[PDB]
Ligand binder design. Sequence first.
Ligand SMILES: COc1ccc2nc(O[C@@H]3C[C@H]4C(=O)N[C@]5(C(=O)NS(=O)(=O)C6(C)CC6)C[C@H]5/C=C\CCCCC[C@H](NC(=O)O[C@@H]5C[C@@H]6C[C@@H]6C5)C(=O)N4C3)c(C(F)(F)F)nc2c1
Ligand SMILES: [Zn+2]
Length: 198
Amino acid sequence: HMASMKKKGSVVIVGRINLSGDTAYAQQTRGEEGCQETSQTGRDKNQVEGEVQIVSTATQTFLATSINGVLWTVYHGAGTRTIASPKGPVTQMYTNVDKDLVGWQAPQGSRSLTPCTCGSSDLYLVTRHADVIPVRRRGDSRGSLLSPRPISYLKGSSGGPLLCPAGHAVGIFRAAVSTRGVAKAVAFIPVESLETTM
Ligand SMILES: COc1ccc2nc(O[C@@H]3C[C@H]4C(=O)N[C@]5(C(=O)NS(=O)(=O)C6(C)CC6)C[C@H]5/C=C\CCCCC[C@H](NC(=O)O[C@@H]5C[C@@H]6C[C@@H]6C5)C(=O)N4C3)c(C(F)(F)F)nc2c1
Ligand SMILES: [Zn+2]
């Protein structure tokens, strides 16, 4: 009934993928208990850094990527949820279920990737474990892994970027094409589709 109706928590940044040096690695910035509390209050005082964030709800963990001052992720991870911030919950500025896409203003202190205009098909997928996986572009929204691997290795990386050789953002990882549990290809939201939404 109305008195007891609950509110879903915010998405919470719990880590990041460090791409600042010669070695990519995941960093945790908040543990599960603090995540639970921050999801309820929507108030996250932690300092944010970098381009790729690891984010969590009470029930799911995935990635989010800053491109042109917007933190983008997948709707199948975030739904319509706010994101926690130093001054409380922040409402989405983009929501498009048809593209499996949502976005919030990028957090104070993040760095944004630049949308790719190279027109190159040699891509790199960045996972939540900081693996950098070469992917050949195979269409507007598909790419093949040069080295297939079990889908287990990609789980939790939706919202992560596909990058060009120069480090520009080409798209946002959405879904994996699985054959007998092996990911041979991935689907992604092209950056042009984000730029249109913008
Ligand atoms: C009401 O609005 C909605 C509601 C629900 C929706 N659920 C959608 O798909 C779901 C979620 C997504 C997923 O698993 N994402 C990844 C990830 O890591 N998620 S996650 O972070 O763990 C997370 C779940 C915590 C967030 C990158 C994957 C990593 C591993 C794969 C694991 C096996 C799953 C294989 C599947 N394969 C597939 O569907 O292939 C088809 C599409 C295309 C490639 C071909 C056929 C696939 O990838 N997924 C199924 C989509 C879609 F748009 F994503 F499809 N839209 C929605 C819009
Ligand atoms: Zn580029």
